[model samples]
Target chain A: INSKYKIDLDKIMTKMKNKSVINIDDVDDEELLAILYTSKQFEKILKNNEDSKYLENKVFCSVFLEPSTATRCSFDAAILKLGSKVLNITDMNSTSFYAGETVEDAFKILSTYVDGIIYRDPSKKNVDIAVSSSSKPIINAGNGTGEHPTQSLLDFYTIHNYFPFILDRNINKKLNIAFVGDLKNGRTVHSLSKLLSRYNVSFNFVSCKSLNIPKDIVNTITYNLKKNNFYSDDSIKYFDNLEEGLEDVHIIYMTRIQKERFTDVDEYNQYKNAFILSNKTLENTRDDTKILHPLPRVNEIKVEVDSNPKSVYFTQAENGLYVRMALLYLIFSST
Target chain B: DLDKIMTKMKNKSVINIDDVDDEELLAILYTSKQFEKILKNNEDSKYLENKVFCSVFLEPSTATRCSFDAAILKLGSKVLNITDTVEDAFKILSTYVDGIIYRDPSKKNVDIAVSSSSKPIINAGNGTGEHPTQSLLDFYTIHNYFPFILDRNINKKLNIAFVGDLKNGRTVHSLSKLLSRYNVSFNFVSCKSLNIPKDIVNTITYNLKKNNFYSDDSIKYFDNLEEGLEDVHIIYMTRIQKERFTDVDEYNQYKNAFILSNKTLENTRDDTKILHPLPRVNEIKVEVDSNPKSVYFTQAENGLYVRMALLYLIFSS
Candidate 1:
């Protein structure tokens, strides 16, 4: 696998090979793209051979230190479908903190008992602590607002599969994507922006002034885009209004108003409905424009928009399983 | 053959004292007494062979939990303990165990858990609602004290006085409710603020009169400890809430108000006794330890018996 996407893919591959451990930085664009392609095949096999237990006797411990209904359950369901046992830690209260046991001790104890560990902690420090201690493969499901690298990989997979024109040189194709809503603390955008920078694409960032994508992330992506020589004359556009940003976009990826990120609730309330993508809003967009969301949404999109042909949030969530399964299989097999 | 018992216990979650009836209470207590003897004498009583008991302790506890664990093990049963909340322990263990014993602090949460779990759930303790096993054991202690009262063919009455914090103590409330079914009169003896709630006292009064039992101010009365214990057969003492009092001096004023000592028993009948739900912290004087009337330890021991009986009756023929 090629290891040059500004992520530490070589270190990741090495860690994974040693004991099936890989952090987000270990995964490069080429490796991720390959995993995404492999997932398409695995999805077929999964549908056809529903009863086939490929990973029998394998136990996957999904320790979500943060409370999540979508990401945690999806990971659990995917593992169970693959004929692997799942040890789900739903909340922090269920662990050793109740018994005064530290996270390091908990992971070390769990690593000895399970084949792999998939952790999602509110603190990036805790995730790093787990990765350092775990002898087994440690997949970062999500670590606070730091990075959701797998989500970026899955987003790329969905885009590449659905619109091969974007990746193909034969077609005059390029994606003018608009990222709406909270971007500063949106880890999904942070990861996806960096990954998208590697491709032949442009972005229109539609967000409140206070919630604009952080300067550090913008700098990293801009530097990478410049280094890769992957740019357009109208490369990066920032908009305070959703209508202007949505006009010429191929895809509009909406993110939730992350209430936890805000210091003031009044500030959050002020910008809560600024970027809502209802049916009325979609009427202004092109018919071919697709809308995506990293969900467990708290009202950024109307429920009625779900039936619209432009909505792809559910499909996006569904694609996460295949992408993750593919990544796990490829990483485990290569090791 | 346990179908009869199942038919009785079916669709009923024993999450608190208010969940059961007088007949059901008697049946469970009687069976627990029998199981107690079986456990003590028989080194190996495999009554619950092939049965699995999932004890999910959502809150930290050792008293009621140890009793349940010992009883399950003594019955040659298996136990799965989920002492933490992090692992979705309730959901995981519910899959494998025959029944669940959940000890949670929140009653609403316990109800939610009971609704979720497929197995029969026994509430170990859910906040301050009730402890059914403690009530059963309290009843057993009362029966042991006045064996003549056990003869259902003969009409009899026993005088019982509850002392100390009647307001907050779930034990006192449950015991009062259970004892209402029998030929007994209760006297409430505590600080005015710590008096038994009016609804419970009303229920007891109605039950006593409805059952054709008669009582004057001599029975169904509330007064200071001296007057309350003047003619009582058993004095049940509970812990006073020091923290609930506005003044430390006020708490101290009522501190020695309900204390049961060897000196106090001299004014009562020779058969009169004292019972405390154990883990006693100076509510009952140390001087009362040598008194033959002191039955708190025996009451604690009977808790195990009552719990074992409940398990056996619920699970076996």
Candidate 2:
């Protein structure tokens, strides 16, 4: 069936199936927007999660060279729900490739063994190198601070589901997005900011001056918005504090400042506790503002915020499965 | 149909070959061959579907872990692949998963896993202790080559040379125990320092007497590996296990002396097949590998089918 936007499902999927899904921008304008057009494809997978029988015989190997607990499990659950086999390739000590095996050579060998590869590395180049070495499709689960496409897709999908603003272009996407905490390093921020830039969207770029979202991303977002003729400089705003950003924004996407990603311990200690979102922070703000986090939080979002209706983090995490299934559904159907 | 297999096989675990009878062992082998066929046309193997298992490794046996990884997926089962150095993890993981396969540095952990879990458990390998699944494939390997041993009445005297470090090689230790159940003789060839451990020696002597099938003449030990190679049906070799030797000279001395070359194998019968639980640190020469007698590669591959069969019996049923 054709979408009201007149997007060809097979044609869009064909372009996607051949290459890797490395970034949020990996799919073109129509294919990216067509995700909403193909809502039931993901919904059907959610309904038949136990026995989707779609990827029953297909093997998708995960090479988490850098250890990740939650993201790795999310991928395995998603793969199993879609009826695919997950080949977990992790821990250097446990594998035959001791120290000398080149990443290119390893990816080549893994490519022969699996139908696709999901490589989450600390190096952004590793994710790109994985795509370069193999003909098999690769999904960049996480690749350092560069991008996390799946997380971004799910975040946008969650927002799309809750707020009617992102549902259709004619219906209008007027919601202001407040991306707070570690904008300088958060890959999720970069990817989601790119996805939202396509619509009639504005941002409260909430961060300390040093940790603000990079100028390069902002430049690209601006360049593309003007090219698409959506919105102008009046749409973007900056803030150093959370309360100021939260007052008017409809979605607050919070990111934790990980100690490993930073250079200094004393600097992190100064901000770690106060950077959190607790009861006192949201007292007089808009009641409907949904709090979303790319979770596995240390202390950035306190446990007390979980019960509040404004916190949609749990359901946002659940939608990770649906969005991933939709991406895999179309991607697999293309092949 | 599945209920019949479940009735035939209780929900117990595979700790060692001693845990199962000869009849049960035969059943596992028979099912393994069926899985090997299923592997080629692996469209519908729903035996392990809906059953989830966790592979808990303290310090991993990479080859063994990967084999199990392939096996679980090949069986239509889900695996919670976790790598940890945490203690009592095996005992803890059993509640969350349908079954647990643990590979650790010590046998105490395996014991903890077994007693704590009401569910089925597989001891992949632990310390210098037994590896039953490795023995299972070694049994299947020899069984595939020579089916005469499948019969209970057959009293044919089979000879096997256990070469390399018998001290720390868990596969060799477990395999020797499993072979003792049959009409098999072992010539344990090693440097005197790394001879088959005293506990294993005591086990062989005790079991050899407790079971009537074995002759008193079967047991032998050697300082020179070449002396033990003559007239054996299977030349089961193993790595030097250099990780155990602290001294450099000690490592070189034992490793150099026990290496099985084409020249060392000159004393053996032409029909003898060479086998190893591999990722070998050159205990058997490369020249011997191509010599039609080398079944180590096939033996390694058969681990997939053997593990698939064991998982089916344990979790799938």
Candidate 3:
């Protein structure tokens, strides 16, 4: 099947061949745009109900040591859409990981059986161990709260399409973006913010005292802002209230306040419903502002906001499929 | 690659080995023979093209899930692995996939899935019940070793020793009845606490009678594992399953009751082959693995082709 969407696949393949996206920093701006270019083709293919067998005869595996139903299924859908195969190891207890074997040994054995591995672990060290041990391509699904590079790429792809102004180097338009909810433990927000800082985007950090963005991340964005000569006091703002964060921003990125991260139930309950973005709240924001959530959304975004045209969280979820298809396609296309 | 089917294997759920008749068994074994070649040559078959399958193991699985996954993908079909629940997962997955290879922790849950789901449910195993595909693969392994067992009116008789815990052993329950379709002598060896079930024994006797044989002299039992090995053609050993046991003292009593070591093999016929539906927990000594008689690894490998053939027959319909 031929792609009707014009994308320079050879350039994407040359850049991404055998490379593992362990972090947002692993991909440069051109490689990032290259992935988005290919994702546009696959999105069209899915929309037109066309078929392609770019990955036939290839068998991949998804080893999610940490449980994630949505990410695992998204990867499986991408693999299946391209006419490849997938073997899922959802539970660590069902594998040698429960049998006292080293994570290195398990991934080494798994690598021998499949063409590539999509691995998720709660520890970054174990993910690094798996990447070193695997002879084939190892896509980091997520590693603890360290990094979720693929999700960041998909987020970038989504914003790049919806805004279209972020890709232009000559355009002097600056985008206002807000990061809400639990940013301290949000790997997605950590990756997404650093990635978005590559363009002309102002940041709004919204959370209570306990759930602020990691200082290292905030410092990196500030460094990026000063290096790009866009360092102004209003370029990055911090707020404790959701209404202040929702003030005329062009993008609202919401994350869940994870219950598992809290040691005390009382402390968790204090922040669980702290920063919900409802349609009532969206009235104060710009009309062009699009909502994004790396989902299986808890009470952070109200169901009323879901039907609003500005809500692209579900579209954000679906874009993961196409972006993943592009990444895996590019990886296996050469290597 | 199947040319024609003379049996009623089209889109049927093999809930038990008893669900398959003599003709269907022959057809399945024959189809497995074809896939064995296809596997050896690394040849791809599009028998399941554009089809998707799911392996839903509600219980912890190693070999069955891996081989079924290997089988489905090797045949040009996609597979999803779900280590989740039964009634809900099965009903949902059956809607999305073409067929389901299901293993459950409760007895008759697969039967419930057969009614609840629209697609064909190939039973991988159920709780202490029949594992029909395990039986099919075990039978295929036997056919590879002893070709004359498939002979209709052969004068030669084959002796099989079924050792270890037969009470909770689903493999022996299915295999014993499956082998009874032909003329063979069954020597069941287990401790008194773990003796073969009376129902399975009766079923085997009835199955032997259906094949026009007086099973009185054909069936025998032994309290000692080594006692029945003198003239056996096949030794099918199963582990004393600790997970199925409630009384730890009773499980400890019979867990080592029938270990087949190198010393235990001295009294046996040299032609006697050993088979185990494995993840074997030391019932057979590792020293015995190097022996030519041990076909458990080969038996495990046969699961791929046998499952490929089963899925082929189901999807063909």
Candidate 4:
């Protein structure tokens, strides 16, 4: 039977069976793209129908065993607009740290009370543990640096909907997307890069030599693109500095210089300004050039650049809700 | 030395009165009186700030739970409440909060709870063994009326009477023990089957200066009521046990004991006050509530003060 809500059977099967979403390799590309497309539609509806009570009596348990603002609150607002209740555990001290109840036990008990679980824990293993035990549908809000499938879905949707020119294979609009700052450890770049590989796009890696994109991600994308009619092209360039990388890039995705990844504060401080996107840097790009940052920003992107038209960070932040809502509905709907 | 004693006495888990001494009791009462003033004035006393009190209600009690919760909040402490299912409430609450106040139906179950809990556990009320705070309040009430009992004055000793069922009434049992500590005489009047328990009577007889029980009918024995009233300073009545009777006809035979009638009051001493721990179901005649001697409202209000004192003693050292 054809399902109205595409279930992403491969991803759900892996999640249900193995209890984790480790990488984009686990999901079929078409299914991932479809979720993003559907999420875009859901986003449009959410923006217009803020007053509609579509999901009354539904209860959502948002287990942020990890900290977040944009993803967490967007899901919270979306669920509230759907007229559902939410149990938020923003404080870690209130949970089983004192009680000695494992994350698995907590999820098992919470499943009885809430209709669904939205988890954002620090470990993929913890999310896996929860998904394995929880009878209720689990939405992986974010799981460490492993996979934030919903965020990738939303990012793809934003790119597809607003900049459709990227999809036209015939139009020689082969845009160069530059991923700047901490690419080795950044989950957003990892997931988004995998999704971009399915399309006719080029990538530019701009980072310190120590924080280049993982070779496994580059190989996976190259292998996937080669399988398709598209051939692997070495037009992909790596730049150690922003001035060298920003030359011909269509989109600049900046990331915070992760202080958490550094052993010494002085080492982090030394390389901090290497990826900083100041207002002066915008002069190097075309007026149509877009800049995006997944935010809770700690001074990577200049605050002054927030007013620029090409700054899609806030829109990207807001898209998290629509994408999450679509994922929630698709997972829960009786297809 | 006083500070160390006060600190140790205050930090005790008040599961029962057996653990409290006369000095500790006096200190608790004095602290509670101060708490009463602070509560009335709406002062911000951050005595228990950052402290958490978990109130686990295994058996539902709206009045007792709310009073304790309010007292804790007044002391600037947070409350974690579990009033849902009793099945896992204790286990779940024991993990989360600092201290626990529980009200269950079984004394043995409460004892088990106290032993299992890592934090201090206060028995808000058990089935029957003891309600230490209520006992303390009853004693405070008697002391309030008869100041000589606390040696504030050298007046005549107070004459107290225990009317209605003394057998199954936990409040009367506790009150009798507490009252025995004072310079007071007792008049225990009840039906033959519902008379004072032997242990309670023996304790009162040995500890109290003058104590006696009268088994005469309240209406027919007007002479005894008059004589008892003339000597009595306070009348601490309790509800007669209708549930204890095996037969409905037998239960109906003791209807006179259930009703504290107007006529019975008229024959008593003018200064003889009445008190009942309420949710009164025609036990103390509604007509008797309006009398000048009715101190039941004051008695009920004292519950908060007594509990405040108990919590202050138990939580703050």
Best-performing candidate as measured by TM-score: 3
> Worst ten-residue run, lDDT, model 3 chain A?
A1-10
Clashing pairs in 1: A9-A26, A20-A137, A94-B85, A94-B86, A95-B86, B32-B309
- The TM-score obtained by model 2 is 0.61
Ranking by lDDT: 3, 2, 1, 4
Per prediction, the TM-score for chain B is 0.88, 0.90, 0.93, 0.84
Clashes of 1: 6
B174-223, model 3: which lDDT tens digit per residue?
A: 88888888888888888776888999888888867877754577888898
Q: Give the per-residue lDDT digits (tens) of candidate 4, residues A1-335.
A: 11233546555534433223335555564455555665666666766864445545455667676568788898888776665556555544324321433565455545544467777766657777777767677777767666676677777767766666554543255656889988887888888888777666778899888889999888867875566545445546788887888887778888777787789988888777777887788788877778878777776888888888878888888877777665655455331
Q: List fnat, each candidate.
A: 0.00, 0.10, 0.10, 0.00
Model 4 Cα lDDT, one tens digit per residue, B44-70: 444665677887776544445655765
Docking class of 4: incorrect
Q: Using Cα atoms with residue i matched to residue i, what is each candidate's TM-score against the true structure?
A: 0.52, 0.61, 0.62, 0.50
Worst 10 residues of 1 chain B by lDDT: B147-156
- The alpha-carbon lDDT assigned to residue A132 of candidate 2 equals 79
